[PDB]
UniProtKB/Swiss-Prot annotation, chains A, B:
Subunit structure: Homotetramer.
Residues in ACT-like domain copies: 7-79, 102-172
Superkingdom of origin: Bacteria
Induction details: Constitutively expressed.
Protein name: L-threonine dehydratase biosynthetic IlvA
Cited function: Catalyzes the anaerobic formation of alpha-ketobutyrate and ammonia from threonine in a two-step reaction. The first step involved a dehydration of threonine and a production of enamine intermediates (aminocrotonate), which tautomerizes to its imine form (iminobutyrate). Both intermediates are unstable and short-lived. The second step is the nonenzymatic hydrolysis of the enamine/imine intermediates to form 2-ketobutyrate and free ammonia. In the low water environment of the cell, the second step is accelerated by RidA.
Family: Belongs to the serine/threonine dehydratase family.
Length: 182, 182
């Protein structure tokens, strides 16, 4: 038998500004229900992606084909018991070189294409260095994301709240500092 | 208000063989329902620990006092929203230096002290370099753990199955290889 309710994918995307947005553009108007990443390698980022399905294995195959035809390396984890039980809860670590990060929590209304619309709303001026999101089937999705400071303080807590997305600065969070910062 | 159902703790323990077992000995006959770790720093390991409570904040305080009196550095994350929503699902990463690991899945019967009994049953001959466990309130707890090879192939799949703990070798798992191995 095969998992029918969701596609679980290990995707490599470029470790550069705007790469998450470009990848989600290809996913398009789908219900992307998980997206987990933390800066590790400076060239290739590793993302754990979950997509809710309505047409089961065939739809999983269509997504895999689309991503390959788009030039992405993807490993299908949909039938992988350790991915389903453990590894989707283990995307983290400290970065391979020291980062100067700002951490924020956000909420976005859930519907097909919502993660894509949220990533576009953030924009690509700052590099995303951490992302954690899992849908709970609720009306709003809850995201944790960090951004590299670069040359200007990220503006998310002003701009995103002006645009109808809840946003809070979490940079001094003790759990982030203990397990993830570096 | 305060969280009453569980204590969530960020604990530093020595990065050495037998350290997890020694820490869980101090926790004793408690319902340890989460224990997440991945080798990072070679001196100090960082563990995310959850303990189910029956006496709420007072019991949380008793656990914190006991751990401090035992000489452990602990940060209380029980009321930390980002820990509860995100970071407990983000304990992972690749190790700070390359490791030669063997990965196994296990199941143990859930009851007070069960994680302690499982860690003692494993023994301390091999260093644990990865641990993921979250209780789902079910009769059996499901663990993912990796061990450094050292000088002898770990014996868990023979010995632990002889002792009434289910154990399977997962060393070639694609999700581990993609997100955690290093
Ligand atoms: C997942 C984030 C990716 C890799 C990239 N850093 C970005 O800012 O889009
Ligand atoms: C969590 C594992 C700890 C740090 C240690 N490596 C052990 O084998 O007990």
């Amino acid at each position: 038998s095969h998992e029918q309710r969701e596609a679980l994918l290990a995707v490599t995307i470029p470790e550069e500004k705007g790469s998450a947005l470009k990848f989600c553009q290809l996913l398009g108007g789908r219900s992307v229900t998980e997206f987990n990443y933390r800066f590790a390698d400076a060239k290739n980022a590793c993302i754990f992606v979950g997509v809710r399905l309505s047409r089961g294995l065939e739809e999983r195959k269509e997504i895999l084909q689309m991503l390959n035809d788009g030039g992405y390396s993807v490993v299908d984890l949909s039938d992988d018991e350790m991915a389903k039980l453990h590894v989707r809860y283990m995307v983290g670590g400290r970065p391979s070189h020291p980062l100067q990060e700002r951490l924020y929590s956000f909420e976005f209304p859930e519907s097909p294409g919502a993660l894509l619309r949220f990533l576009n709303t953030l924009g690509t001026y700052w590099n995303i260095s951490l992302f954690h999101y899992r849908s709970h089937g609720t009306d709003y999705g809850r995201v944790l994301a960090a951004f590299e400071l670069g040359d200007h303080e990220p503006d998310f807590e002003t701009r995103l709240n002006e645009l109808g997305y809840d946003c809070h600065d979490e940079t001094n969070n003790p759990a982030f500092r203990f397990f993830l910062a570096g």
